[PDB]
Ligand binder design. Structure first.
Ligand code: NAP
Ligand code: NAP
Lengths: 246, 246
């Protein structure tokens, strides 16, 4: 029944993208998170502490592959989101694949209460998308004129975001290779709404104790089976897993 | 940097214990938990739903190997703990290793408010240990006379349990191969107190959303590095990991 996993293959620069390729067509919502062994998403309020040697490799790759990075407004402020920096070689590979040189950032907010003075609009090569509700879209649009394209992502209720709508709105703009890196609330809603296609999860070899929240938070409770596509490791005992929805 | 993990070896009946052996001497506190990809310890309030094909294999093995199973009084009630059932072959292998035929159960409680009428004392081959505080030990001892050996596990504060003391009290009684299966509060305190030597964690290939709590709960925040001793898998995409403290 049980099989021992072992390192059978060293990954170099180029086999790595293959492992994390998006499907050749269709919208694909990929999440990339890190957590402790005991499910803590945070250490001292952020994720960067737990980050593996591999983790920044993988984190960067997934960004390189994404058409858009979708992020909750909470993570933007907390993780200090600025523009998606692509290095010269990253830009090259993106252009080679026919994508823009830098992935778009898309910020999800139900409230739309994004300060014009927010950090996220400032140090960036590209104006973010703001994914919000039909209700607040117009005001948000005017308030953020010149700083962000504001997109209504309501489905039926104009006062909330419909996550499948959100996904289709991004697809609608050719941003079908979607990466989300947080936060837990956002991820929680993707999970609740069953629109998460893939979870790339770094499991950091730490226990952090009970204080930390999980990589998903919120009222959602589901039981979505996923298929383990791969587990990578490094010498530091990290697991870089990639699971795709059944 | 990254290595692809793959199934290199089929585990049979007998190589499995080797992977999960306790050190030949010394006290060893091993936890065995299961969680979802997104760190949920529970589904609908229990853990059994997520359980792999492998998971009951491993769960049983770890029990077979343990001198004592330490459990919070919460898990006892919630998971419906009765006596540790060992099958005839399990008993045999335990005797072969010089252990009692059935592992002892040890219930941790600060309050000591264990009903004499509790389920845990009833359907069992062996009287449980009750690990509690110096303060309530005497009353708990009298109240549970005939049903459980009550052991004070205070260190300095007689009103709380000192987890290192708890471990030594079990060692003191020859129960040095310790398995805990919960709950999160208990595990949280083992983690807080840095007495957890090993975490065997089943990662079930599900996301469950934000409602679930983690396999550790409580106020504790630590950053304890662990070494990945092994990752096993099955066809169902479960990971049966074993991490030992650095
Ligand atoms: N371990 C990891 O991998 C990881 C990764 C990322 C973040 N984190 C951590 O998690 C924490 C942040 O948590 P968080 O839950 O507040 O982050 P968040 O999900 O990014 O932010 C929450 C806010 O974003 C908006 N939002 C999220 N989902 C939405 C939805 N479905 N529809 C409309 N708006 C939505 C809402 O904004 P409005 O209030 O404006 O409506 C919501 O209040 C930080 O500590 C961060 O470091 C950890
Ligand atoms: N996914 C998994 O692998 C897994 C495994 C096990 C359990 N669970 C789940 O977790 C839930 C139970 O959570 P829980 O935190 O209440 O379980 P718990 O830790 O077993 O029970 C908590 C209680 O046990 C006692 N306790 C725990 N740690 C103690 C300590 N260091 N010192 C003194 N007493 C201590 C206290 O009893 P007193 O109040 O009497 O002082 C405490 O209130 C259930 O839903 C269960 O299914 C999940």
């Amino acid at each position: 029944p049980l099989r021992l996993l072992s390192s059978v293959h060293y990954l170099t620069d180029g086999e790595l993208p293959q492992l994390y390729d998006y499907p050749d067509d269709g919208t694909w919502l990929r999440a990339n998170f890190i957590s402790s062994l005991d499910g803590g998403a945070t250490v001292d309020g952020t994720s960067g502490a737990m980050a593996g040697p591999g983790d920044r490799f993988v984190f960067n790759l997934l960004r390189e592959l994404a058409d858009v990075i979708v992020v909750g407004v909470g993570t933007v402020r907390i993780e200090g989101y600025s523009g998606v920096r692509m290095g010269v070689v990253q830009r090259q590979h993106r252009q080679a694949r026919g994508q823009s040189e830098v992935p778009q950032l898309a910020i999800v907010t139900r409230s739309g209460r994004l300060d014009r003075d927010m950090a996220v609009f400032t140090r960036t090569e590209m104006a973010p998308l703001v994914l919000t509700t039909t209700a607040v879209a117009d005001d948000t649009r005017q308030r953020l004129a010149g700083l962000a394209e504001v997109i209504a992502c309501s489905g039926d209720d104009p006062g909330t975001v419909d996550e499948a709508v959100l996904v289709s709105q991004l697809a609608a703009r050719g941003l079908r290779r979607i990466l989300t890196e947080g936060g837990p609330t956002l991820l929680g809603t993707f999970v609740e709404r069953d629109v998460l296609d893939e979870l790339c999860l770094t499991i950091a070899p730490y226990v952090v104790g009970g204080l930390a929240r999980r990589i998903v938070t919120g009222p959602g409770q589901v039981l979505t089976r996923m298929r383990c596509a791969h587990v990578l490791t490094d010498d530091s005992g990290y697991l870089y897993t990639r699971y795709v929805k059944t």
